[PDB]
From Swiss-Prot, chain E:
It comes from Drosophila melanogaster. It is an enzyme of class 7 (translocase). Its EC number is 7.1.1.2. It is a multi-pass membrane protein. The gene is mt:ND2. This is NADH-ubiquinone oxidoreductase chain 2.
């Protein structure tokens, strides 16, 4: 249940696996930023405001994640089309939720434009079939003359393997 | 010619451009024939210029 | 070719010799005469020397580059009267002209990119070195960071085209065709910034004003045409995807042409109004480029050639009032018909060239561009009429308010007009009416 | 040829003539670089730019010799790379098969209408 | 830094220890060479005239011995799990090895010691620190095959190393933050090649030698100190400041070449988004390079008039003007190069 | 073993420092891996030579033998806790003191 | 004819560039050839240590 991905099922197929996947990415990002937060800038003292800063920096990211996933599922299941503007609506909704945590209306839309751009680019990646971070098909372990670069003084004993 | 050859693509593109310019001159001369029909047959341009048009 | 490149390479040591400012423009006009002689070009690439060749589009753009730089050495006598660094100025101009010749006579996309982004460093040097404003730092940083921010992912697009095709040559890349959104955005948006859009223009009116006269010539004369040349080379293999996404850029460019033409009626600077005037005509160029017709491409090439002369000639006119009246403000520049009456001939002859004029090449470029855009859709007849009406609504305002009316009181005594300035604005207008004769040269590059 | 044979693409037939600047570009470019470096040294020390021409001669000779030596090593490197590519094409005839050339007439694809 | 022959002895033994590190065929002899390099880089980075150099050497000691013991512990753990030095399927012990190497190198999750130590040094020990001391960890990073740690390090290096150098007006901390961004381009090249990394590292080293020689001969440690620097001809000061535009990656100068080879090899390796993330976050590096270039690109300044003679070394500035010529005219030598292929 | 980046004279001393080649229970297994790493190299030796890798790791790492020993000892204690085995027959006949 | 020759040269260069990209991709996929994409692991030190350990068996004595 906790190992579910976002794209193991199509859009609108299951809700809970998408909520768990996007929320666990939000929890990982919030914990990774909060560990660098409370030790470097605005360092709190005591057990209670440290956990308060952890909740304040993690839970709003969870709210952005679940709001984007919920309005993405609503825009997907409200019609028959599965296209990139549902991801645009979800990015606008996540930006609007982020704005509420900011308490600035301008921040919410300004965030929704960039999150919708990220959503339509990710949906373009899903539709076309390429990856953001693929494995390298070519990995140059060294240059040419890689067998003749052995500048060692020790004489080689005769090998125990042949090609015959 | 084959897809991998770029020698044929340049030569066929050049004769396509040359045939385009020749056919443009065909249409231009055929239009100038109608213009000369309109000027030479000034009152009666309705009847005579119809095969040219 | 290699004759012009080695001519400028051996004209490089002319800068280090003292009292050698005026011989360099003499040799530049001589090599412009030699480049007028070497005109055996057709639509394909000719005079193939290694990686350097030339077709008709490249011929017109190198000839425009040589004429603009040769007049750029003629316009800047303020550098020669003062002891400002003439050797560095001449070296920067020769290096920048050599880079423009190298990026226009490039056979391939990558050398075009390399000398294309090498060209912005001498423009940076002229803007931050020889300008007369405290905001030269705001001028050059906007230009460099706009063009660099949108031109860095174009390099990823260029090597994606190289990995999919194999070659870098323009003809072998003309055969292929791509169906990708992001490749189209990478290979287009850098030129979409390099020619002025409505949304991405900002570097233009804040980099023309704070530059020198030579920065104004090199920016509005040939470096709004690097993007046009780049789009003329890139659009040939991205036809299917630009036909999907071209209505957004054409609508934005046409409404932005109308809006920037409404901006110039509320402009109080001579050098800023020509800076926004470059946005409106290149909006028509951009709107006619994406229709992919024969007439749109030919009229775009004709209007870029005829705009690089007239905008630079207007920028020389705003300089010879800035040198004497002491400011570029439109309120100060009033009644120059009674101060310089012989200059008023060149003001109206170069302001009429900015709009539709009877003998100029700008009208033959504007006629062949409106043909393609009216052919593209009938809804564009509403906003082409508004744009081409507002163009002479604002362009007559600069000549009318600067060259007619009561005189500005409290102006101190300045010098009269000079033969160099009359010669400088002579060579910005007689090419505009001598090139309608043999106009099949400067229009049919296809 | 009617086949797209991978072995004949890397095999040098010998019909490619080197250019006039190909054997002589790197020594003269490195000699001009050495002369310009000596001029740059003389400019940075506020000496006359052609004072001490022995430094210019030594820098140009060092540049010409280094350019000729590394150009010969570059040619040997490219010859070894070509031999490596030909040997890997010869050793694996299944992963790189001769492919029949196709005339445009057999293919039917996508005119993009502009209209 | 040549006040004594003992410092030349420490230089050759730190060269020997780094060469022992990068040629070790086991994970423990590499640690042996790391300790030799550490022993010979403690007395350099320490001097009697500068008070901050001793506490900076204390910071270097604590940072490196924290990183070296974690490197030893994880290598012994790898050897306890599988008794060969390599690993078939990559696991968490390789992640601990790579994190201990990233604390040594100075990647941006672990880079906070780097400019804080750099705030109190000289310009020759900085030249040893950002060039030679990046040899020993980065050449061990190439032995591991995990991707996401390198991805996080490259992304964090190019955003944090570019943004964090904007507030700094000290030249040493700004060069440290610029070297942090140029570190991320080296690790992005390490995922795709072991030769393009050598190209980028050698020319980044070349740019580091020619740019830190400008601040070492004339003793420049501040942005405002560049405006008061007296050069007899202002054209020479304008020409000497083109190494910032060279190292920032501008096409007519050298320094565009290694970044361009990284771009060429990454696009051929189908990695486009990380390249865009680096190149949108390298414009800030050219922004704080151009903020240095305020002091030379204008042709006249409001100079202080008490100093009227430019004082300089002879041998060091003779070596400087050779490398300044090839920093801006070095793209003519691309026809002679054959090590890209 | 790790392939060094550079092959200088300074790898001649570090290379022989740790190795099962000096007399050991199964250095002859490690040699049968190591020559295999001369045949396919380091990266193709991770795939094409996986059977000889696991025997050397099984021998000197002692993984499955100790896991089998702990499975045989925990099952005996589970049988003791579940009441199947109790009393003086909890432990079997011990070996002789010089048996191994 | 100059443009025809230059186009033929550039087209053949394009085919050889595509073919060497394919050859390099198949070489890096399998790590087969000994020029690129190959990490040379040598057992020279293991054979030296085994020869030394065999040599010190003769030295064992009194
Ligand atoms: C808030 C959370 C911030 C950090 C999230 C990190 C997530 C992550 O690492 O995902 C890995 C993934 C890896 O992607 P991928 O392409 O490898 O996905 C393939 C996935 N499998 C193998 C399962 C098929 O990264 C992304 O998805 C990145 C998407 C970026 C989208 C926006 C791009 C434009 C941005 C403009 C500004
Ligand atoms: C100066 C010397 C710098 C260090 C390079 C030493 C060397 O021989 O490198 C070999 C390398 C060849 O790579 P290589 O094949 O030896 O790489 C090692 C490969 N493994 C890890 C598999 C063993 O040369 C280069 O990469 C060229 C570097 C040129 C630097 C100077 C440019 C001018
Ligand atoms: C937007 C920025 C992030 C884009 C991320 C996705 C790119 C990607 O991976 O494409 C792969 C796709 C597909 O690549 P492919 O065709 O090689 O796919 C091979 C398949 N895989 C990846 C699985 C091995 O690339 C393209 O569609 C072609 C474009 C290549 C260059 C991409 C550059 C990215 C930057 C885009 C910037 C656009 C605006 C520029 C101007 C404004 C700048 C601020
Ligand atoms: C960018 C600008 C660079 C510098 C350009 C400098 C001016 C060059 C002008 C060259 C064109 C030209 O004048 O062609 C002559 C033209 C060339 O045309 P033509 O005589 O060859 O006629 C055939 C050409 N078409 C088909 C276009 C008509 O000469 C004439 O038209 C002759 C009559 C001239 C009219 C009377 C002039 C005053 C007396
Ligand atoms: C590629 C360029 C190829 C050039 C081929 C011809 C070179 C000829 C050089 C010698 C003659 C130069 C003319 C002359 O009078 O020079 C005296 C001048 C001035 O000598 P000076 O004695 O007045 O010195 C000035 C005074 N100090 C030193 C205090 C500054 O010297 C030079 O020009 C020497 C530099 C030669 C530069 C050659 C061109 C390339 C420049 C590239 C810049 C980017
Ligand atoms: C310090 C300079 C170091 C230069 C590179 C030395 C070789 C490094 C290397 O790894 O080579 C192998 C690499 C790749 O070769 P390889 O990888 O096939 O070689 C491995 C096999 N060995 C080492 C045994 C030969 O080659 C290069 O990097 C050569 C590049 C060109 C080198 C010359 C550049 C300068 C040219 C002249 C400049 C101007 C001179 C005039 C002015 C002088 C003023 C003082
Ligand atoms: C520090 C440097 C920056 C780190 C940035 C982290 C960004 C998010 C991320 O990469 O998360 C990793 C992981 C989710 O990614 P994935 O690989 O799909 O998980 C597989 C799960 N078996 O995230 C997780 O698995 C986190 C799961 C929840 C952990 C916290 C529970 C309380
Ligand atoms: C997690 C997102 C939490 C909410 C953030 C704010 C709203 C963002 C909207 C767009 C999010 C991306 C599209 C949805 C999606 O699929 O997210 C999950 C994705 C990683 O999932 P996947 O591609 O399956 O990776 C598995 C790798 N083991 O994760 C990502 O692609 C990362 C999120 C996008 C990039 C960062 C934010 C924009 C800059
Ligand atoms: C609002 C800001 C401007 C628009 C941004 C892109 C979002 C958008 O408009 O997406 C809609 C569309 C989706 O594509 P499509 O599948 O054709 O939709 C048909 C639905 N009837 O999208 C498209 O057709 C265009 C896709 C654009 C991809 C991203 C372009 C910007 C890249 C740089 C981003 C960073 C700066
Ligand atoms: C700097 C300026 C950058 C501008 C970038 C513009 C990128 C977006 C382009 C939008 C576009 O072209 O959308 C076309 C798309 C409809 O395309 P099509 O596939 O023909 O329609 C399906 C019909 N059944 O239409 C759509 O997908 C509709 C897009 C709606 C966007 C809403 C944005 C709200 C904010
Ligand atoms: C690329 C960007 C340009 C690099 C070179 C800038 C040269 C600037 C220039 O024109 O300097 C002129 C200058 C005049 O002398 P000045 O310094 O004013 O004397 C004051 C005395 N107190 O100084 C001089 O005339 C003397 C210095 C001339 C330096 C010439 C360098 C020649 C390089 C030739 C090879 C180029 C690369 C080939 C590969």
């Amino acid at each position: 249940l906790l190992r579910s991905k976002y794209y193991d099922h199509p859009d609108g197929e299951d809700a809970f696996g998408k909520i768990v996947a996007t929320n666990k990415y939000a929890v990982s990002a919030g914990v990774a930023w909060s560990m660098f937060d409370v030790l470097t800038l605005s360092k709190p003292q005591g057990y209670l405001p440290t956990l308060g800063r952890f909740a304040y920096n993690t839970g709003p990211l969870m709210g952005m994640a679940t709001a984007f996933t919920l309005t993405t599922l609503v825009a997907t299941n409200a019609r028959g089309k599965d296209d990139k503007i549902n991801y645009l609506i979800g990015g606008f909704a996540a930006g609007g939720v982020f704005g509420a945590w900011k308490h600035n209306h301008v921040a919410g839309l300004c965030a929704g434009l960039f999150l919708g751009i990220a959503g339509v680019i990710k949906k373009m990646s899903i539709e076309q079939g390429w990856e953001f971070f693929p494995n390298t098909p070519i990995k140059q372990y060294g240059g040419l003359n890689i067998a003749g670069n052995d500048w060692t003084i020790m004489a080689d004993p005769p090998k125990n393997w042949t090609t015959e | 010619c084959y897809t991998d050859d770029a020698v044929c693509r340049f030569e066929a593109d050049q004769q396509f451009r040359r045939d385009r310019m020749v056919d443009n001159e065909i249409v231009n001369i055929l239009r100038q024939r109608f213009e000369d029909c309109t000027l030479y047959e000034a009152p009666d341009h309705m009847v005579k210029c119809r095969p040219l048009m | 070719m290699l004759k012009i490149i080695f001519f400028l390479l051996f004209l490089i040591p002319f800068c280090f010799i003292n009292n050698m400012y005026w011989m360099v423009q003499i040799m530049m006009f001589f090599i412009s005469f030699i480049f007028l002689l070497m005109n055996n070009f057709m639509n394909y690439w000719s005079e193939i020397s290694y990686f350097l060749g030339c077709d008709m589009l490249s011929y017109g753009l190198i000839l425009l580059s040589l004429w603009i730089c040769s007049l750029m050495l003629l316009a800047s006598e303020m550098i020669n009267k003062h002891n400002n660094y003439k050797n560095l100025f001449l070296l920067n101009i020769i290096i920048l002209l050599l880079l423009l010749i190298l990026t226009f006579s490039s056979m391939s996309l990558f050398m075009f990119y390399l000398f294309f982004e090498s060209s912005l460093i001498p423009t940076l040097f002229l803007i931050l070195g020889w300008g007369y404003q405290p905001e030269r730092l705001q001028a050059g940083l906007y230009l460099l960071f706009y063009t660099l921010l949108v031109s860095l992912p174009m390099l990823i697009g260029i090597f994606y085209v190289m990995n999919k095709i194999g070659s870098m040559n323009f003809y072998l890349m003309n055969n292929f065709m791509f169906n990708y959104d992001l490749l189209y955005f990478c290979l287009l948006c850098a030129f979409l910034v390099k020619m002025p859009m409505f949304l991405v223009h900002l570097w233009l009116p804040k980099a023309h004003v704070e530059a020198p006269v030579s920065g104004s010539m090199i920016l509005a004369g040939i470096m709004l045409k690097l993007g046009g040349y780049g789009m003329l080379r890139v659009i040939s293999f991205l036809q299917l995807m630009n036909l999907k996404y071209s209505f957004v850029w054409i609508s934005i460019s046409l409404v932005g042409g109308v809006l920037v033409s409404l901006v110039c009626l509320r402009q109080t600077d001579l050098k800023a109004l020509i800076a926004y005037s470059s946005v409106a005509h290149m909006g028509i160029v951009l709107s006619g480029l994406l229709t992919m017709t024969y007439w749109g491409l030919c009229g775009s090439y004709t209007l870029m050639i005829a705009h690089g002369l007239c905008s630079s000639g207007l920028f020389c006119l705003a300089n010879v009032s800035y040198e004497r009246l002491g400011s570029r403000s439109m309120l100060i520049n009033k009644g120059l018909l009674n101060f310089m009456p012989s200059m008023t001939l060149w003001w109206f002859l170069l302001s009429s060239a900015n709009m539709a004029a009877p003998p100029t090449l700008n009208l033959l470029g504007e006629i062949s561009l409106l043909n393609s855009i009216v052919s593209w859709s009938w809804i564009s007849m509403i906003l082409l009429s508004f744009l081409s009406f507002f163009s002479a609504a604002y362009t007559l305002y600069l000549y009318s308010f600067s060259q007619h009316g009561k005189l500005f009181s409290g102006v101190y005594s300045f010098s009269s007009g000079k033969i160099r300035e009359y010669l400088l604005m002579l060579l910005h207008w007689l090419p505009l009416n001598l090139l309608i004769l043999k106009s099949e040269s400067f229009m049919l590059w296809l | 040829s009617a086949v797209n044979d991978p072995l004949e693409l890397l095999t040098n037939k010998g019909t490619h003539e080197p250019s006039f600047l190909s054997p002589i570009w790197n020594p003269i470019a490195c000699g001009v670089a050495g002369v310009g470096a000596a001029i740059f040294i003389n400019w940075g020390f506020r000496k006359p730019v052609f004072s001490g021409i022995q430094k210019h001669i030594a820098f140009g000779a060092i540049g010409v010799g280094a350019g000729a030596y590394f150009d010969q090593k570059r040619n040997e490197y490219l010859a070894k790379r070509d031999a490596v590519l030909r040997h890997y094409i010869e050793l694996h005839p299944d992963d790189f098969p001769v492919k029949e050339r196709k005339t445009y007439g057999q293919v039917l694809e996508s005119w993009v209408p502009v209209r | 830094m040549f006040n004594n022959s003992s410092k030349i002895l420490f230089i050759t033994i730190m060269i020997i220890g780094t060469l022992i590190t990068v040629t070790s065929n086991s994970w423990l002899g590499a640690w042996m060479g790391l300790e030799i390099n550490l022993l010979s880089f403690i007395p350099l980075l320490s001097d009697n005239n500068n008070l901050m150099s001793t506490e900076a050497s204390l910071k270097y000691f604590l940072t490196q011995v924290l990183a070296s013991t974690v490197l030893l512990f994880s290598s012994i753990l790898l050897m306890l799990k599988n008794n060969m030095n390599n690993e078939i399927n990559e696991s968490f012990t390789s992640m601990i090895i790579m994190s201990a190497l990233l604390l040594k190198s100075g990647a941006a999750p672990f880079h906070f010691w780097f400019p804080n130590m750099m705030e109190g040094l000289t310009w020759m020990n900085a030249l040893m620190l950002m060039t030679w001391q990046k040899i020993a960890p980065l050449m061990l990073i190439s032995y591991l095959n995990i991707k996401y740690l390198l991805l996080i390090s490259v992304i964090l290096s190019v955003i944090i190393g570019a943004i964090g150098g904007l507030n700094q007006t000290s030249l040493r901390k700004l060069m440290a933050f610029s070297s942090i961004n140029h570190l991320g381009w080296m690790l992005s090249s390490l995922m795709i090649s072991e030769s393009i990394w050598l190209i980028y590292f050698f020319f980044y080293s070349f740019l580091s030698f020619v740019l830190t020689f400008m601040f070492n001969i004339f003793k420049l440690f501040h942005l405002n100190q560049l405006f008061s620097w007296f050069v007899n001809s202002k054209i020479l000061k304008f020409t000497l400041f083109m190494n910032f535009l060279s190292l920032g990656g501008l096409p007519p100068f050298l320094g565009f070449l290694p970044k361009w080879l990284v771009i060429q090899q990454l696009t051929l390796c189908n990695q486009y988004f990380m390249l865009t993330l680096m190149m949108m976050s390298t414009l800030i590096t050219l922004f704080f390079y151009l903020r240095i270039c305020y002091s030379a690109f204008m042709m006249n300044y409001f100079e202080n008039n008490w100093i009227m003679k430019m004082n300089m070394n002879s041998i060091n500035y003779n070596m400087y003007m050779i490398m300044t010529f090839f920093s801006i005219f070095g793209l003519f030598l691309i026809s002679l190069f054959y090590f890209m292929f | 073993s790790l392939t060094p980046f550079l092959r200088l004279p300074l790898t001649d001393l570090t290379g022989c420092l740790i190795n099962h080649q000096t007399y050991d229970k199964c250095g002859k297994f490690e040699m049968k891996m190591m020559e295999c790493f001369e045949a396919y190299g380091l990266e193709r030796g991770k795939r094409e030579c996986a059977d000889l890798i696991s025997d050397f790791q099984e021998c000197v790492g002692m993984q499955k033998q100790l896991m089998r020993f702990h499975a045989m000892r925990n099952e005996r204690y589970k049988q003791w806790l579940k009441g199947e085995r109790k009393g003086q027959e909890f432990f079997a006949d011990p070996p002789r003191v010089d048996a191994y | 004819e100059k443009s025809l020759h230059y186009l033929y040269e550039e087209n053949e260069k394009a085919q050889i560039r595509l073919l060497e990209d394919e050859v390099r991709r198949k070489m890096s996929e399998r790590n087969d050839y000994q020029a690129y994409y190959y990490r040379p692991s040598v057992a020279k030190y293991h054979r030296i240590s085994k020869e030394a350990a065999d040599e010190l068996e003769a030295l064992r004595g009194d």
